[PDB]
Write a protein that binds this ligand. Structure first.
Ligand SMILES: [Cl-]
Ligand SMILES: [Cl-]
Lengths: 8, 149, 149, 8
């Protein structure tokens, strides 16, 4: 999700 | 000095952020929970006392002071459970300004995190690494190491 | 020295216990998750780096070494993400003996806790406070304070 | 539940 905690 | 911590509970995004502050250094640990209960507070203090040498905790409100489960965790971990009455009036202000600063930081990082709990740990990291010049993470290690020696 | 940590993942009760070991002291932090994923490992490292000055982490397997989410958390927190190949063969044995010891302690406390995660935090507490005589909690503070000065 | 993490 392009987040540090969920790069998907 | 070295073993005294204070609990603090603030709200954001419809959830609760529970914080433990090491009073002498300003170093903090925090977690996000859906609501503050004795059971969650007790588990949080068990985590804290396995990580730092926690002698006394000033609880954040009378419900967590009274809670049998918080008392059980404090007994298990060898912590003196105390009230958190601001006998020194400057204390209310210091906690309030901390919660304000933590929420500011959370807003600054919030778009880098899917979950609030990630943003709160980013805020914990920035708070504990900021130099004031030593940081609060430096000051708590120095204080505890001085106590050990 | 002061900033090197190693990840370790062990299984109990159908769940996973993720552990970070500060290599120079033997101090540990741990959590229980339903299964080891890059996202959970990344969040765990972000917590750890907000609490201690983590310079390098030796990851526990090639999946968490490769994970883009673990790489992102390590970039965010300023950690050098490394492999955890036991170039010193004595390492496999030290980690394995640690996992055996932690499971033994979990078993000894397990009936005082409703949830496994509480028993694991009780084991973390007993492991970090045990005097070997200094405890691992004393040694990690000693080591980091010496580094700061 | 007379447990340290749940005294009910
Ligand atoms: Cl609440
Ligand atoms: Cl797994």
């Amino acid at each position: 999700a392009l987040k540090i905690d969920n790069m998907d | 000095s070295p073993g005294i911590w204070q609990l603090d509970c603030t709200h954001l995004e419809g959830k609760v952020i529970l914080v433990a502050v090491h009073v002498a250094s300003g170093y903090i640990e925090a977690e996000v929970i859906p609501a503050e209960t004795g059971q969650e507070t007790a588990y949080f203090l068990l985590k804290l006392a396995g990580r730092w040498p926690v002698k006394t905790v000033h609880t954040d409100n009378g419900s967590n002071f009274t809670s049998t489960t918080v008392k059980a965790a404090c007994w298990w971990a060898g912590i003196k459970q105390e009230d958190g009455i601001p006998y020194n009036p400057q204390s209310q202000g210091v906690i309030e300004s901390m919660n304000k600063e933590l929420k500011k930081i959370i807003g600054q990082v919030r778009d880098q995190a899917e979950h609030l709990k990630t943003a709160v740990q980013m805020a914990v990291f920035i708070h504990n690494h900021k130099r004031k010049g030593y940081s609060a993470g430096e000051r708590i290690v120095d204080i505890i190491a001085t106590d050990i020696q």
